[PDB]
Design a protein around this ligand. Structure first.
Ligand SMILES: CC(=O)N[C@H]1[C@H]([C@H](O)C(O)CO)O[C@](O)(C(=O)O)C[C@@H]1O
Ligand SMILES: [Ca+2]
Length: 217
């Protein structure tokens, strides 16, 4: 039953699923999809669509890989651009970015709304107001940009940002954040090609953990 089933992780939390983990939800078109629910962070009910923790998974992937999703339920993944669109089409979803450095410090950024458009509009980022958080704001500067991968350049640069910079993102010319960049393990000498959130640790520090997640506003 789709119209009865959970639409997102907050629906699951409301029904007494108190531990984080993988659960089936029903997308707007009633397709079932297994997603990671973060029930532990900031009240819980978050649907996680990106997670890095150890560099075990290669994130320097093509349009196809990002479109469908890749990685492991047991570790690092990207849920998939088709999936992220479907998840964020209904209602208003807040975005939370959780970051952890190699010195064990947890930082976060919250945004009042977050939507990605369909493939026809290149999974364009539609981002609401920055709320706050220790990590600072490195995503507003990407608002209204298409998603790009190495093999499909939709950025606003004469260059290919995804190739630069070794990731996949709503690149502008080119980025303030690059959470799908190389897992560089803390400080790095290469410029802006790591898991970077520039408002916090700048362009030459690659985070240990990155998570991107959504909850009804
Ligand atoms: C990684 C990256 O793209 N860095 C570029 C940044 C970002 O676009 C930015 O800081 C947006 O917040 O802009 C510059 O500093 C700039 O044009 O002055 C050039 C730099 O190469
Ligand atoms: Ca370009």
């Amino acid at each position: 039953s789709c119209a009865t089933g959970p639409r997102n992780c907050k629906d699951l939390l409301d029904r007494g699923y108190f531990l984080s983990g993988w659960h089936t939800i029903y997308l707007p078109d009633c397709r079932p999809l297994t997603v990671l629910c973060d029930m532990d962070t900031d009240g819980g009910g978050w649907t996680v669509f990106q997670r890095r923790m150890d560099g075990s998974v290669d994130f320097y992937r093509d349009w196809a890989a990002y479109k469908q999703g890749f990685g492991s339920q047991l570790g690092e993944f990207w849920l998939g651009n088709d999936n992220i669109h479907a998840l964020t089409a209904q209602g208003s979803s807040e975005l939370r970015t959780d970051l952890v450095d190699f010195e064990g410090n947890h930082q976060f950024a919250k945004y009042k709304s977050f939507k990605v458009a369909d493939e026809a509009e290149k999974y364009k980022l539609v981002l609401g107001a920055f709320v706050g958080g220790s990590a600072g704001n490195s995503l507003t500067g990407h608002n209204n940009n298409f998603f790009s991968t190495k093999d499909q350049d939709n950025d606003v640069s004469s260059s290919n940002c995804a190739e630069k910079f070794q990731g996949a993102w709503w690149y502008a010319d080119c980025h303030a954040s690059n959470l799908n960049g190389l897992y560089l393990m803390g400080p790095h000498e290469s410029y802006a090609n790591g898991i970077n959130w520039s408002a916090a640790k700048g362009y030459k520090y690659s985070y240990k953990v990155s998570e991107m997640k959504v909850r009804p506003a």
